[PDB]
């Protein structure tokens, strides 16, 4: 019985979505469906992308759609849809919870066994909402966030230290910005921890602090530069990295927004939290690593922000 | 030994996509020039942060300064204003000639030995102008046009006949749209020419005709679907293919706008024409293939349109 | 979702190279089967230890046990003995028929739905025997032969004419050596047929002749240079190209030994013949292309050799 | 018109052919396959060349018996030598191979003195030194492949034991092979969690960890006993190309390699080639000093002593 090609569906055909599509084709991960609510635009992007394929020697296809039925049989669904943020935090959540409702039902009704990667903001709460309305189990939904902060952090360290990105490992948990927890003892260059590099005078403590700080603010930095819109190349790269670990059963461990069970990281209740997460053919699984008292106090900031958003979201739903 | 260097003059969507491709294919360091404030830096920062994910150690930086073109091995020019309603051809010409001047002088003063690929429209004339103001020799300037038409033609063929893009070869000459010359004898699926497939009833002449027509209008088709902007993925793929052929000394023969000396193809004067062109470490060399009488007549149309633009450009410049 | 699985039956140089290529191209897990003790495990271990260097998480293991064939999506068979002095043709057949029986039964009992690519010589007869003892349907067995000849033909043409391998297409039918059928009308460089290039004085008949001949004798040429063994890199590459077309549902059309039904190519009985064959997720399908009277005559020579081996094999089996 | 990169492989046995193949696949440049043996390198080159139309590659490979063909090489990778046969003495082994390094070395000296030189010939501990001595290349343009292989093995074993991507497993070593290998167990880590921490946490049994170290020490011999003929070549070739590729792409990777370390670094008294973290860039190689534990340093001393002894035996042969 002939084997079906892999099928990746991208819900949201903006710049991040088109970039996801392009990477999926180049890496030959499977057929691609580009979904967007906007008429014509997803088709136009699909067609353009499809026409790259003869140049690259690729026979996977890409098609545009405004219809949720076309999510059928998707192995992976990657969600970038939503409305960007003088709009209140209440109104923002309201509009996007709605969008997560629509996307979620689409998933529920058309590919309930898909692996679901959420990129929509605010990621802290949107990943929870998208599970809630799609009904997918804990191990089949994950949010992209840590991998981007880590890519940024690695980028900054590689340039500062003049070393390959392949020897730079940057570890984070928590959210973005002031909710990001940098794991500076475990982060290392070719096995030498960032704190050891300071102690050795190979890296100024000031430089390290500036790099951490620049990583916290990295999205905003690109926004200020772009004048219009936000980062999309690195975010897409992160999403595909994650998708690829699922599709190729790689068992990578990556900082992602994953539902963590009560007890792990001293949590009182199940919560989506940015934590090291295994990604395999079996979906995702959070990993508990030992962290310092300081890093844990910092993790508590994110947990408390997330709890606050969960409460606001509950109120909106009632 | 210096890393290779690709400068992209123009950081619109095509330019950004070129950059992304150059990084994924590890072709060298990339400089993303644009006249706009902040934006080239922002995209370049975003792109540079993909690199840790993809394990790449080539760098990309943004700039407003022609000095950063220094030592570029390749320069791909996408800068220019797209035509709009009710902008006259004279107006588009006037505007883009002046960009070519500014870009030409940047090249001439900062990397006069670069291999220059022109993508700015109207391609029929902008390649000519880019040479005139850069001062680069005939073998070091080339326009991207035919490869895009080819990719589209192959895409449609591959889907129509249900075969791998790797077994579809589409040969064209001339310009876009009504000036394109489809070579239906040379073009073939797995060695069976398109006209032969028609004789065999494996492809209806109507279908071939619709596919030819669709390729002529391919650019406009995507425009109409996008509603904002033009195609950019397939154009970027085409541009990078040509660049790779130079960088890797591949000696591919690709349909490009290259300077053809009086005599070849029956020209009574030197012209930039869309012809099969060898791309190697020595630059470009147009190749004369045998074509039918009919095919020659079609090419005459393009030749006339180029000669016409050449007169218009000369006037504007005086 | 199960990882894809490629079993290589035969862990000689071709088998090892197949395995290496499969790993590099991330096509799935690999099982390296051989009747020899230790050696397949040893190569498999060596190959597995490349993986961290290449960033690949697919696995390779060695085995003596047909049970390890279970669930193989693809099986590529290279097992057999090479002909040697003064071992007769009959001596070889008797030996390799037996291997095919063992291998066939292994396939039948452990992965009867695999797509099977046969490489064992004499290819003209061994694919037939492999199907007979494996019991796999017509659309799931194919022999590698033409693609290797094609590759060589292209190599020589590319060097001779100083052009990219990506603009050289070489089409052949039939078997190797004196049974090969060169298709000089369909074969072309950048859309200009080899014949046309002769008419044009761009390629002397003599050179085309020496290249054709050299392609006929390509296997023996390498044998003579190596002094021990036979070619294996290009054969493995060929094998993996075919496997990839199956795995990625590419629908490439490639010259392969495939079962042709009575009526096609004028056959009065079903035979395995080297013909253009579509490879897709649905397995193989021979394709009839129009060929010249002369070309047809040359194919008849192959057809006669295959009929002769079929009689010789039947006798041995009785 | 810029020249294509040129990689020359001195030795066209299984490792050399494999190095050629990877170089084609990764499109690193034209390849020259040198061997003393008549025909064989040409046969391998032709077979390899004939892969290229299938892969879409326009880089070329050719065979040669002539040192003149090393001209203009950006990188030279040396696998040539005679394998220890039984019952061959250590003296005779050294003697034969020092001679081969002499000939290879002169070839480099006379034909591509600006090449980046990767030595794989055994015993690597001494051959890298000899090859520099006869080629005359400076300290930053010669390097020995050894650590990268041990680390690939170590990572391979860890990834399988822990069910994790090879991309999240970093295994750090210095010193030589086998009993001269120094495992850096505290720096080695899975997704930033050190191997020792994994033990402390019950995620890895100490015994398992010890077995994996031990299996890495013996990893070459494990494959030799399995193959019955010859030794490992896939992973050794992959290691050598990773090294070559960091040079050619100026990657600035830091990799455990046999490099010339200056007196004072790692408490050395004199200049020696030692397996140490080494930066590989377009500027060649540079050893990096990392802090190691007392225990690890004691273990490093075992390699240093074995290297000294070989340097002594080598000098006595030359005199």
XYZ file of C-alpha atoms in Angstrom, chain C residues 71-290:
220
model
C 9.531 -3.728 8.307
C 12.253 -2.673 5.858
C 10.785 -0.061 3.519
C 13.580 -0.679 0.996
C 15.906 -3.623 0.550
C 18.963 -3.231 -1.711
C 20.611 -6.558 -2.585
C 24.334 -6.692 -3.460
C 25.115 -10.160 -2.056
C 26.734 -12.693 -4.433
C 30.142 -13.669 -5.717
C 32.041 -11.941 -8.471
C 32.970 -14.030 -11.495
C 36.567 -15.097 -11.543
C 38.846 -17.214 -13.720
C 38.159 -19.868 -14.706
C 34.784 -20.041 -13.083
C 32.307 -20.469 -15.851
C 29.232 -18.470 -16.446
C 27.291 -21.480 -15.406
C 29.360 -21.815 -12.267
C 28.449 -18.244 -11.264
C 24.794 -18.646 -11.998
C 24.563 -21.663 -9.847
C 26.172 -19.841 -7.045
C 24.266 -16.627 -7.301
C 20.912 -18.237 -7.963
C 21.340 -19.913 -4.575
C 22.114 -16.648 -2.844
C 19.010 -15.082 -4.432
C 16.924 -18.023 -3.135
C 18.261 -17.450 0.390
C 17.875 -13.698 0.128
C 14.478 -14.021 -1.578
C 13.141 -16.248 1.145
C 14.492 -13.827 3.752
C 12.530 -10.998 2.094
C 9.408 -13.076 1.667
C 9.354 -14.126 5.353
C 10.390 -10.902 6.943
C 9.482 -7.881 4.828
C 7.280 -8.957 1.922
C 6.126 -5.373 1.286
C 9.588 -3.894 0.799
C 10.629 -2.164 -2.373
C 13.510 -4.289 -3.620
C 16.390 -3.032 -5.661
C 18.685 -5.750 -7.045
C 22.346 -5.052 -7.815
C 23.746 -8.647 -7.783
C 25.250 -9.825 -11.126
C 24.523 -10.961 -13.744
C 21.855 -8.343 -13.300
C 20.073 -9.453 -16.449
C 18.961 -12.654 -14.658
C 19.411 -12.024 -10.925
C 16.462 -9.554 -10.606
C 14.173 -12.158 -12.138
C 15.387 -14.761 -9.643
C 15.154 -12.379 -6.730
C 11.438 -11.778 -7.520
C 10.757 -15.451 -8.054
C 12.096 -16.408 -4.613
C 10.981 -13.276 -2.735
C 7.515 -13.397 -4.252
C 7.260 -9.562 -4.485
C 4.943 -8.046 -7.093
C 6.146 -6.567 -10.394
C 5.879 -2.984 -9.208
C 8.166 -3.662 -6.208
C 11.279 -5.125 -7.792
C 13.798 -3.373 -9.981
C 17.398 -3.812 -11.049
C 20.064 -1.143 -11.053
C 22.002 -1.013 -14.288
C 21.088 1.803 -16.687
C 21.540 4.569 -14.123
C 25.226 3.615 -13.743
C 25.740 3.631 -17.492
C 23.936 6.959 -17.729
C 26.203 8.392 -15.005
C 29.316 7.325 -16.787
C 28.098 8.595 -20.139
C 27.373 11.955 -18.519
C 30.746 12.076 -16.847
C 32.589 11.591 -20.080
C 30.319 14.028 -21.932
C 30.674 16.702 -19.278
C 34.449 16.560 -19.384
C 34.634 16.388 -23.158
C 32.302 19.378 -23.719
C 33.290 21.365 -20.650
C 29.867 21.800 -19.156
C 28.056 21.123 -15.921
C 26.875 17.593 -15.235
C 23.477 19.177 -14.536
C 23.064 20.141 -18.226
C 24.081 16.668 -19.554
C 21.362 14.058 -19.949
C 22.322 10.584 -21.155
C 19.623 8.096 -21.971
C 20.297 4.363 -22.409
C 18.328 1.165 -22.472
C 19.089 -2.505 -22.428
C 21.970 -3.905 -20.323
C 25.691 -3.284 -19.949
C 28.470 -3.589 -22.484
C 27.449 -4.953 -25.862
C 23.821 -5.121 -24.723
C 23.561 -1.432 -23.870
C 21.466 0.771 -26.061
C 22.658 4.326 -26.404
C 19.858 6.816 -27.262
C 21.799 9.507 -29.007
C 18.796 11.434 -30.237
C 17.310 11.844 -26.731
C 20.653 12.379 -24.997
C 21.490 16.036 -25.045
C 23.620 18.782 -23.581
C 21.534 21.788 -22.492
C 18.770 20.739 -24.912
C 20.980 20.071 -27.972
C 20.998 16.438 -28.896
C 24.230 14.547 -29.176
C 23.381 13.886 -32.753
C 22.754 17.501 -33.370
C 26.039 18.403 -31.832
C 27.694 16.122 -34.414
C 25.836 17.663 -37.362
C 27.038 20.973 -35.956
C 30.668 19.874 -35.727
C 30.573 20.634 -31.994
C 31.321 16.946 -31.310
C 33.135 14.708 -33.811
C 31.386 11.415 -34.589
C 34.614 9.778 -33.599
C 34.557 11.265 -30.122
C 30.921 10.361 -29.683
C 31.838 6.875 -30.755
C 34.797 6.620 -28.347
C 32.580 7.912 -25.495
C 29.813 5.466 -26.285
C 32.314 2.659 -26.425
C 33.980 3.841 -23.214
C 30.573 3.791 -21.492
C 30.067 0.219 -22.765
C 33.321 -0.852 -21.228
C 33.087 1.394 -18.150
C 32.911 -1.401 -15.602
C 35.859 -3.291 -17.103
C 37.942 -0.107 -17.315
C 37.720 0.401 -13.520
C 38.270 -3.305 -12.856
C 41.495 -3.095 -14.892
C 42.676 -0.058 -12.934
C 41.739 -1.326 -9.484
C 43.445 -4.691 -10.023
C 41.297 -5.924 -7.014
C 37.459 -5.771 -7.137
C 35.021 -3.603 -9.100
C 33.502 -0.126 -9.113
C 31.339 0.621 -6.107
C 30.979 4.333 -5.528
C 28.995 5.136 -8.674
C 26.994 1.910 -8.384
C 26.008 2.799 -4.785
C 25.140 6.319 -5.801
C 22.895 4.886 -8.508
C 21.229 2.581 -6.098
C 20.559 5.358 -3.614
C 19.151 7.592 -6.364
C 16.568 4.952 -7.153
C 15.840 4.247 -3.481
C 15.357 8.000 -2.827
C 12.924 8.311 -5.682
C 10.888 5.597 -4.026
C 11.244 6.979 -0.512
C 10.503 10.571 -1.480
C 7.861 9.635 -4.040
C 9.786 11.628 -6.606
C 8.433 9.964 -9.795
C 11.769 10.066 -11.507
C 12.053 8.250 -14.778
C 15.283 6.237 -14.824
C 16.682 3.437 -17.000
C 16.331 0.304 -14.808
C 15.749 -3.454 -15.183
C 12.005 -3.737 -14.711
C 9.399 -6.319 -15.706
C 7.921 -5.318 -19.037
C 4.559 -6.991 -19.979
C 4.125 -8.763 -23.330
C 3.124 -6.089 -25.936
C 5.263 -3.257 -24.681
C 8.392 -2.707 -26.770
C 6.952 -5.526 -28.951
C 7.736 -8.269 -26.391
C 5.956 -11.573 -26.993
C 6.338 -12.488 -23.319
C 6.813 -10.679 -20.021
C 10.542 -9.953 -19.389
C 12.832 -7.972 -17.186
C 14.435 -5.419 -19.516
C 16.448 -2.216 -19.055
C 13.856 0.430 -19.847
C 12.883 3.915 -18.677
C 11.059 3.218 -15.460
C 9.080 5.604 -13.242
C 10.042 5.206 -9.558
C 7.506 6.536 -7.041
C 5.879 5.632 -3.698
C 3.813 3.228 -5.817
C 6.948 1.351 -6.837
C 8.080 1.018 -10.448
C 6.309 1.271 -13.741
C 8.093 0.778 -17.020
C 7.464 3.486 -19.547
C 7.352 2.990 -23.286
C 9.210 5.616 -25.244
C 9.464 5.758 -29.028
